[model samples]
Target: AQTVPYGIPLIKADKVQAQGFKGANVKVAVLDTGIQASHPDLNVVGGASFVAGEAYNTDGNGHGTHVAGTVAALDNTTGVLGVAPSVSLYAVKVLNSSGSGSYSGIVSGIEWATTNGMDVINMSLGGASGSTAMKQAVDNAYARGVVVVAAAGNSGNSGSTNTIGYPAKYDSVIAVGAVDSNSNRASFSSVGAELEVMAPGAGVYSTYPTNTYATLNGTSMASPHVAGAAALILSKHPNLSASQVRNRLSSTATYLGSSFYYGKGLINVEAAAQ
Candidate 1:
């Protein structure tokens, strides 16, 4: 077996994989800047672009590539492994090279994922507020049994009250916050009622473009851990609904005693998979 990456052990993904679940047959769509199609560590099955003239199969901003790597980087001897290494990854390029994209592009990506039978949708991008169209897209994906996971945002007010951003704040999405290796909430991770769970986000290592690895941080990095966990659950219990998966994650979390900062708490993928 390949050595589990540090982030995988922090989230107990290695234990989950030991139980014979690695998200096989699960289709995960990463709605972000795009993915590095040529990255050897990533088994990108297919994708589409909402960004005009941009190839959906390629990542230029590096954000989406990191996000995708966290979700499904292949289990191999030379590269870091992901939480759900066998899941089919789809690069839904909604954002541009500058990591900026319109709400319509995001909505279109959501609709595309739902229509194309995606089991999980990971959005590592967000804005300050929500839009009706984005809400509808999220709700629609949930209605079709797709587990939507997103970053809670990186706008923490240094322990003061912070609001989750955009689609993550919507009822249908699983808003994820970030924690460090010590299990403390990350300083940049937004906090609020919308935060459903937390994951290791600080100094997390994952695949990068041009056949390399990088260490990055944010609730953006945290969201895909939950997304990968969702994929693992669905892979083992193929009949589980989106709501059931969400409930399982929240219920299995290691509670940190404060709902405002940690929501249900940090995700335990091993327990959730079982």
Candidate 2:
């Protein structure tokens, strides 16, 4: 097993309770594999698939399920609990069975989320290059007060700087990078000015494919931890404007340094809520 220099606690479920945000009625739009409704931890409310008239949301690739579980896995006795276990899960299956999708599908999902009254939007997928259509869709969604969060991309292995992925790089979205329990940025996390925040990404243990659990590492996992935390904050301070919520999150972040990759710093859920 790989040993980490630091190991932070799993940001206990009780911590969310102490912050007065036990998920509440907040609806999180998960634009990823469609969740496993049968999964004990994933309580999916309703969702739609944009896979060209599929009319159904299914997790053929399983990546979306894992990401969704990280954000709103049920607070149950059988498996692991999500950060905001009480929040509603709204599956928006933009990707196909192959774990990939078109930019148009992603835009359509965002439109769906906006129309369906989603408070928060979690996008664990991104493209190395961006399109104007995607940028406009994300900006329009944010204009409507939807908190858009996305992964910073997994392109660091290519040795490219400022490689933060698109949609996440769009000014309207909150681009999240990956860090370990020790509060160190992951080697694979894309870096640049678009990076707005960091979260536990390396060796992340969360719900996975087929109602099972596993430890995966990526900015994909880190993105939803922040999403879940955002839901918790909104659940408590419902009166706060979307911008205020964003401000609180950024201002309260644990400042890692003067860089975009680390952004403000590692997210401190307890501190942010307070």
Candidate 3:
């Protein structure tokens, strides 16, 4: 707990850690730009790239590495701590260095995760539009027993309109929104009927590429918190279906508002582990 990130305690991951659950044996696929496998503060079990010409083990954009760190950074004293510190992270690189990618790559990544028997898929990237192909891919993954989590999009509003984006808006994916340390919803966090949970996304400090660190803000960051939380849950309940994991997460939330802005509300890992 020496260098635990603020989000770790904000979501009560610390409480779960005290009980000796580090998401061991759970396989998580990080469907993002990429991750720095050489980073000392984190570890990458293995991965492949759907993005053309880019290596999955290298993150040209710092976003993927940051998100990965939030999920599975090593349990150490100098760098940030993850929600599930010992989870096996697979670099499912779907996006390129620009943090941009197409639906085809995303679909391929989802299919890869499903085929690889990943227990959880963390999609911190998505499009402004929806596609049936992406839906099918995510649905397929969910049906195959993988817990799919994605960003709810950054298009926030008057706390009433639906601004969620694709794949995330799908029924099979757990759409996550952003909240600050004080639990206030980030102004840029998307709201929707599909929005499933909230987590720390503002000023989130975690590992960057090649032995570095950074603080970022977005629903992108929040999604991994739920992703790792699912890994933590799955490590214990290995037989739980994707639907069961979703239900367990929502049921353990701390209500912050109606079902739109916060969905079930801010997720509590400690409560979920119970």
Per-residue C-alpha lDDT of model 1 across residues 151-248, encoded as one tens digit per residue: 99998855566678988899899999999989999888888878899998888888787778898999999999999999999988999999999999
**lDDT: which is higher, 2 or 3?**
3
Model 1: residues with Cα > 4 Å off, grouped in runs: 1-3, 158-160
- Candidate 2, residue 101: the lDDT equals 89
Instruction: Give the residue spans of candidate 3 off by over 4 A.
Output: none
TM-score for all models, in order of appearance: 0.97, 0.92, 0.97
**Candidate 1's C-alpha lDDT?**
0.90
Clashes of 3: 0
For model 1, which pairs clash?
Answer: none
Q: Could you tell me how far off, in angstroms, the CA of residue 166 lies in candidate 3 after the best superposition? A: 0.9
TM-score-superior candidate, 1 or 2: 1
Which candidate achieves the best lDDT against the true structure? 1
| Model 1: per-residue Cα lDDT at residue 171 | 86
C-alpha lDDT values of all predictions: 0.90, 0.80, 0.90
